[PDB]
Design a protein around this ligand. Structure first.
Ligand code: MG
Ligand code: MG
Ligand code: MG
Ligand code: MG
Ligand code: MG
Ligand code: MG
Ligand code: MG
Ligand code: MG
Ligand code: MG
Ligand code: MG
Ligand code: MG
Ligand code: MG
Ligand code: MG
Ligand code: MG
Ligand code: ZN
Ligand code: ZN
Ligand code: ZN
Lengths: 82, 127, 147, 97, 83, 138, 104
RNA sequence: UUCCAAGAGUGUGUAUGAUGAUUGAUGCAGUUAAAAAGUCCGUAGUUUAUAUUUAAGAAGCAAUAUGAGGUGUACUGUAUAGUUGGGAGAGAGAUGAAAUGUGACGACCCUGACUGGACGAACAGAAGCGAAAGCUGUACACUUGUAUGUAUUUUUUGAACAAGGACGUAAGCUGGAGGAGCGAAGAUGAUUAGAUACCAUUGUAGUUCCAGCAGUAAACUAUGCCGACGAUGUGAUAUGAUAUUAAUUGUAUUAGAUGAUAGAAAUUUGAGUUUUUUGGCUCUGGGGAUAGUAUGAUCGCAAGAUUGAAAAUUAAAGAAAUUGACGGAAGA
C-alpha cells in the first residue's frame, strides 16, 4: 500500500485527472463493415456521425459517452508502426 | 506565499495523527529548498517530486520527529542587529530550533546568517 | 471558481505527452492543407476546424502535421491573417441575439440582467488586448441599437 | 438559544412557499409549517350494518368509503390535543408511516 | 437644453398652477411630433386639424385621434378582428 | 489590509477606529476648556449666599448640609458640601470660602446627589484644624 | 439548453444573394431588366403602389417565365433583412450564388 | 486608653501617563452577550501559480441528456356571487350561549338555462431551478442556467472592491381600465364597574390590469467572498465506466446519525487545523441610558430615506446553564 507506487486496483478507482501520471483515454480505431468490406478511420468518443466508405450509411453515432456501433462491425486500436 | 503555507498546514495535520506518508498536488522551487534544509539537520526521511506538464506533485515520508512547522507572511526585511529579537519570540529554548532566511547566498540557517554577517528577508521556522 | 457563477466542476480534456508524427493517415499531407484553406476563406471558425480535422481525417493534434506551428500561427504564413481574435467575435454575435429579443418583449427583465454579465465579460478581454497592442486602439464593436 | 434543528419547519434550499388557510380559525399559514392528517370513514355506520341487509333490493353489494385531508395552524392543533408536548430527549423521534 | 425639467411647457411662464402644466406636457409632446407614413414609409406625417393626419411626401390623409396618431382604444379592436 | 507596501492604508484606517475611544474623544473636542464648571485649577474662591440642607438617597436616611456660593473667576452659581460635624456654626453669610473637589473625575460620590465640591477654608482659617480646635474664628 | 432554429423560407435565402451574387434595386432598373430579358427573379415589397405592381405582373408573363415572389413587409423591414443602403420597393436579381431561390 | 505604616516629613486635591491583550502591526471580538450593508456588476488604492514555458480562465462541440428559470398569443377546470323558467309554501343563517340584521311583493332547498371577477385543490417531499426578492392547468413561439464526458481554439487575460450602475415581497403615491369574495376608517347588537377591544351584522379606500415614482422588513442559515488538507454508516438529484438481469464504482451538489476536535455553554465537518497565536481583500463594534433624538448637507409630488452628536445623568445592563417555587399548563 504505497502512494508513490500505486496498484492496478487503485488506478481503477481514481479520476483521470488525479492520477500519478497523466494518460488520456482516447484512441483511434478502424471499423469494418459487414456487407461490403470497407475500413474507416474513427475515434473513441466521436462527436459526429461517421459513414461507411462504400455503401454510405450509419456506422457510429454521437452519445454522451463512448461511441455506439450500429450493427455487427468489428474494430481494433491502431498505434505507431515505425 | 500561498504554496509554502499550504505545505506547512498539511504536515501539522499529518504528523499529529501519526501518518507515514503524504502526497501534495503542487511543487515549487521555494518548497524544494525548504525540504533540503529539513533533510540536512535530520528531521524527516527522503522525499520525491514528479513533473507531469502541470502543477507537479510532492511525496514525502515522515518518521515522527516534528513538533510544529510554520511560515511567516509578509516577508519582513530584517537587519543584522534584530536577529536576536526574532529568535526569542518564535523559539522555545536556546539549545535548539531553526530559522530559514532568504539571503542572497541562499536559504540558510540563522547560525550561518550571524556567522557570515548577512541580514535578509525572513521565511519561516521549524523544530 | 467560475467567473460569474458558483461552480467547482472539473471536466476537461488532456492532450498527451510528447506527441510524434501520426502514420495511420490515409489522405496525403498536401491535400489536408488544401481543404483547411477552403474552410477558413469560406468563414467557419478555427475551433470548428479542429473538430472536423479530428473526426473524419484521423489526426488529433494539429501541431504535428505542420512544421511545429499552431493553427492560428500557421494561417498567417499564407496571407490569411486574423485581425480580431475569435473570442471577441463570438461574444458580439451572442450579444446581438438578446438585443433582438428585447425589442419584441419589453417586460422580460430577466434577460436584461443577462445582457449586463456578457457585456462586462466582453470589456475585460478588450481592455487587456489594447495593452498588448493586438487590436488597433480606436476600435469599437458594432452593436444593434435599442429603441 | 435554539430549540429545534430545523427551526420551525422542514424547508431547505428554497426562499418561499405560498400560504394556505386553517379550517377552524382561518389564519394564513405556510404550507411547510402545517399539520396535516388523513383518515378514511365509511358512509354507513357499523351500528347500521345489519339493518340495510334486510332492506336491500340487491343481492350483494359493497359499502363505500371516502377520504379526507385536513389542515391546521399549530395554535388550533395543540388545543384539540392532536399534537402534544414531548420530552426534550424524546423530541427527536420521527414516526413515518 | 436650457431647462431642467419643464420642457415644452416653458412658454406658459409662472402661471396656471403646477399640476395644470404637467397635464400640458403629456399632450403637447405627442401633438408636435412627426410620424412614419404607413403608405410610403417616410417620416413626414403631421397634424393640421383635429382628427386629420396627412403626409408631406405622398399626400394621403389618415383619420385618427385628437392628439395622437393612434388611439389606445383604437388598437385593441384591431386585434379581435384579426382572430 | 495586511501587506508589505500598505502603510498608507493602515495608518488611515487606524485613525478612524481610534475615535470611538470615549476618553480620546473628549481630548479632540476640547471639552475641558469649553464646559468646565470651575475653570482649570485645583481650588477657587466664592461668596456665600445660602445655608441649606439636602436629603440623601435611599436606602440611607440623613440630612446633608450644603451651601450655595458664587465664584469669582467665572461668575457662576454653584453648591458645595460642608464636610465635617458642627462646622456650619462658624459660617456666617457675606463671607468668603475656598472650594476643593471630590476626586472621582468630575462625578458625584457617596449618596450626596448632584454635588461635586466641598469647602476647605473659611476666612483663611483651615476648617480641618478648626474642627480639631487648634485655632479660633475671628 | 441553447439551440437556435434556422430560418427556412426566403428570409434565409435572401442574405445569401447579396453576398455571393449580383443585384439591383429601384423600380426604374426593374423595368429595364424585364424588357431586355436579363433578369432572373423579382422580389417586390408590400408597399408598392397598386398601379406599378400590376404592371410588373403583366410584363413578366410577356418577357417569359420570370417568377414573382411576394414579401410581407415594409421597405424599412427589407433593408433590415439584408443590408442595403436605402429603403427599396422592388429588388431585381441579376445573378445568384449558393442561393436556393430558383429551386424553391 | 493602647497598637500599625512611613519618618524631618506626612497627607488632601486638579491635570496626564501606566494598570489595558478595554485600540489589539506583533496582539482583541463579529450565530445567540455591542457588532457581516437586502442581492449582484464595476473604476482609483491593495494583491498575485509557475523549473519562462505550461495549469487555470475565456471561447466552442456531444447527449437536442436534465430542470414549478423568464416573457408572449390561443384554449380549459370546479367553486362563491348575481339575472331568469318549473315545483312547493315556513323559517332559514351564526355562536360558549344569544341578540340586532333577514323571509308570504314567496327566501331556504331540488331543477333548466346565462353573464362576469379572482384562483389552479387532492398528487405536493427535510424533492428541483434561480445573484437575491421568488417560481405549480394544457398546446405552441421566443429566450436562459449549473453539472458529467472528450488528443477542440487562445495563452495568463486572476480574487475583492472607495467613485459610479441595475434589480428589490408587502404596504403608500400620482394618471387611465375593472370590481366576484375579503376588508383598515365610520356606524349598530351583546359582555363589562368601564369598553370607542376580543364576539357578531354592515360598510369605503385598497388587494386585479397597463404606464411610472418610491427603496424600508426577524430582507434570518440572526453565520461576508476566494484557496490547501480531513473518520465510518444509511439516503437524495444528474451522469459516465465496468458488467450484464446480477451488481459494485467515478465526479459535482445535498439531508441525517454515531464518534473525534473546538467552545463559557447550549451545540458543532467547521463555529477545526490558536498564547506551540500570520495565504489574499472590503465593511462593522468599544459599559448602560439620553437616541437612531436634535442640527447641517444631499435625494423625493408627498409620506419619508441615507449620513448622524452633545449638555445634564447612572453601578450596573447582559449571555448560557443547575436547585427550588408558581401556572386561570399537559399526561399516567
Ligand atoms: Mg468577481
Ligand atoms: Mg423570506
Ligand atoms: Mg485618588
Ligand atoms: Mg474586548
Ligand atoms: Mg437578544
Ligand atoms: Mg446581539
Ligand atoms: Mg393541478
Ligand atoms: Mg446539480
Ligand atoms: Mg480603500
Ligand atoms: Mg456604493
Ligand atoms: Mg427601481
Ligand atoms: Mg434596516
Ligand atoms: Mg443583518
Ligand atoms: Mg447576507
Ligand atoms: Zn460497408
Ligand atoms: Zn387555526
Ligand atoms: Zn407618406
Amino acid at each position: 500500500f504505497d502512494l508513490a507506487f500505486p496498484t492496478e486496483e487503485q488506478i481503477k478507482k481514481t479520476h483521470k485527472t488525479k492520477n500519478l501520471y497523466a494518460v488520456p483515454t482516447g484512441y483511434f480505431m478502424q471499423v469494418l463493415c459487414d456487407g461490403c468490406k470497407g475500413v474507416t478511420l474513427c475515434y473513441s468518443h466521436s462527436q459526429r456521425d461517421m459513414n461507411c466508405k462504400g455503401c454510405g450509411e450509419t456506422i457510429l453515432k454521437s452519445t454522451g459517452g463512448k461511441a455506439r456501433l450500429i450493427g455487427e462491425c468489428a474494430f481494433k486500436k491502431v498505434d505507431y508502426s515505425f | 506565499m500561498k504554496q509554502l503555507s499550504n505545505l506547512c498546514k498539511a504536515i501539522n495535520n499529518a504528523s499529529r495523527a501519526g501518518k507515514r506518508q503524504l502526497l501534495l498536488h503542487e511543487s515549487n522551487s521555494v518548497t524544494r529548498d525548504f525540504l533540503k534544509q529539513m533533510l540536512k539537520h535530520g528531521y524527516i526521511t527522503k522525499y520525491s517530486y514528479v513533473d507531469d506538464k502541470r502543477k507537479g506533485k510532492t511525496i514525502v515520508w515522515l518518521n515522527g520527529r516534528l513538533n510544529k512547522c510554520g511560515a511567516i507572511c509578509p516577508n519582513y526585511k530584517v537587519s543584522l542587529d534584530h536577529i536576536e529579537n526574532y529568535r526569542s519570540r518564535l523559539l522555545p529554548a536556546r539549545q535548539f530550533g531553526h530559522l530559514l532566511f532568504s539571503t542572497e547566498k541562499g536559504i540558510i540557517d540563522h547560525n550561518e546568517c550571524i556567522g557570515s554577517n548577512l541580514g535578509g528577508s525572513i521565511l519561516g521556522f521549524f523544530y | 471558481a467560475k467567473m460569474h457563477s458558483s461552480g467547482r466542476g472539473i471536466s476537461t480534456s488532456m492532450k498527451p505527452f510528447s506527441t510524434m508524427f501520426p502514420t495511420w493517415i490515409d489522405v496525403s499531407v498536401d491535400e489536408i492543407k488544401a481543404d483547411v484553406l477552403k474552410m477558413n476563406t469560406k468563414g467557419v471558425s478555427s475551433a470548428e476546424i479542429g473538430n472536423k480535422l479530428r473526426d473524419v481525417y484521423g489526426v488529433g493534434d494539429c501541431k504535428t502535421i505542420f512544421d511545429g506551428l499552431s493553427l492560428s500561427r500557421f494561417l498567417e504564413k499564407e496571407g490569411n491573417f486574423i485581425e480580431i481574435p475569435e473570442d471577441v467575435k463570438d461574444l458580439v454575435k451572442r450579444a446581438n441575439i438578446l438585443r433582438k429579443h428585447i425589442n419584441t418583449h419589453s417586460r422580460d427583465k430577466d434577460s436584461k440582467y443577462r445582457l449586463g454579465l456578457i457585456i462586462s465579460r466582453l470589456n475585460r478581454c478588450v481592455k487587456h488586448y489594447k495593452k498588448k497592442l493586438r487590436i488597433p486602439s480606436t476600435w469599437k464593436p458594432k452593436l444593434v441599437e435599442l429603441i | 438559544p435554539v430549540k429545534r434543528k430545523n427551526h420551525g419547519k422542514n424547508r431547505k434550499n428554497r426562499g418561499s412557499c405560498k400560504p394556505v388557510q386553517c379550517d377552524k380559525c382561518g389564519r394564513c399559514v405556510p404550507k411547510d409549517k402545517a399539520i396535516k392528517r388523513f383518515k378514511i370513514v365509511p358512509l354507513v355506520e357499523a351500528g347500521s350494518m345489519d339493518d340495510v341487509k334486510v332492506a336491500s333490493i340487491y343481492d350483494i353489494f359493497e359499502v363505500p368509503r371516502i377520504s379526507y385531508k385536513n389542515q391546521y395552524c399549530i395554535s388550533c392543533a395543540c388545543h384539540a390535543r392532536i399534537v402534544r408536548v414531548r420530552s426534550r430527549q424524546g423530541r427527536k423521534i420521527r414516526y413515518d408511516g | 437644453n436650457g431647462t431642467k425639467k419643464v420642457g415644452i411647457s416653458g412658454r406658459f411662464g409662472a402661471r396656471y398652477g403646477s399640476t395644470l402644466r404637467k397635464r400640458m406636457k403629456k399632450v403637447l409632446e405627442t401633438q408636435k411630433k412627426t410620424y412614419e407614413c404607413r403608405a410610403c414609409g417616410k417620416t413626414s406625417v403631421k397634424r393640421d386639424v383635429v382628427g386629420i393626419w396627412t403626409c408631406r411626401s405622398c399626400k394621403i390623409k389618415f383619420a385618427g385621434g385628437a392628439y395622437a396618431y393612434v388611439t389606445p382604444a383604437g388598437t385593441t379592436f384591431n386585434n379581435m378582428l384579426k382572430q | 489590509m495586511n501587506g508589505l507596501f500598505a502603510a498608507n492604508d493602515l495608518i488611515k484606517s487606524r485613525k478612524v477606529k481610534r475615535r470611538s475611544d470615549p476618553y480620546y474623544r473628549k481630548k479632540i473636542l476640547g471639552t475641558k476648556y469649553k464646559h468646565s464648571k470651575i475653570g482649570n485649577g485645583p481650588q477657587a474662591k466664592g461668596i456665600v449666599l445660602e445655608k441649606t440642607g439636602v436629603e440623601a438617597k435611599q436606602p440611607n436616611s440623613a440630612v446633608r448640609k450644603i451651601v450655595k456660593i458664587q465664584l469669582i473667576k467665572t461668575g457662576k452659581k454653584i453648591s458645595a458640601f460642608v464636610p465635617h460635624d458642627g462646622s456650619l456654626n462658624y459660617i456666617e453669610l457675606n463671607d468668603e470660602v475656598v472650594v476643593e473637589g471630590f476626586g472621582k473625575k468630575g462625578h458625584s460620590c457617596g449618596d450626596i446627589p448632584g454635588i461635586s465640591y466641598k469647602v476647605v477654608k473659611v476666612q483663611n482659617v483651615s476648617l480641618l484644624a478648626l474642627f480639631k480646635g487648634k485655632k479660633e474664628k475671628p | 439548453s441553447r439551440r437556435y432554429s434556422k430560418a427556412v423560407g426566403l428570409a434565409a435565402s435572401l442574405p445569401l444573394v447579396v453576398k455571393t451574387g449580383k443585384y439591383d434595386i429601384g423600380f426604374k432598373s426593374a423595368l429595364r431588366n424585364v424588357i431586355t430579358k436579363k433578369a432572373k427573379c423579382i422580389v417586390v415589397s408590400s408597399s408598392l403602389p397598386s398601379v406599378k405592381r400590376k404592371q410588373l405582373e403583366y410584363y413578366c408573363v410577356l418577357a417569359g417565365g420570370i417568377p414573382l415572389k411576394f414579401y410581407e413587409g415594409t421597405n424599412n423591414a427589407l433593408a433590415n433583412l439584408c443590408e442595403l443602403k436605402y429603403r427599396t420597393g422592388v429588388m431585381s436579381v441579376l445573378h445568384e450564388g449558393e442561393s436556393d431561390l430558383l429551386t424553391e
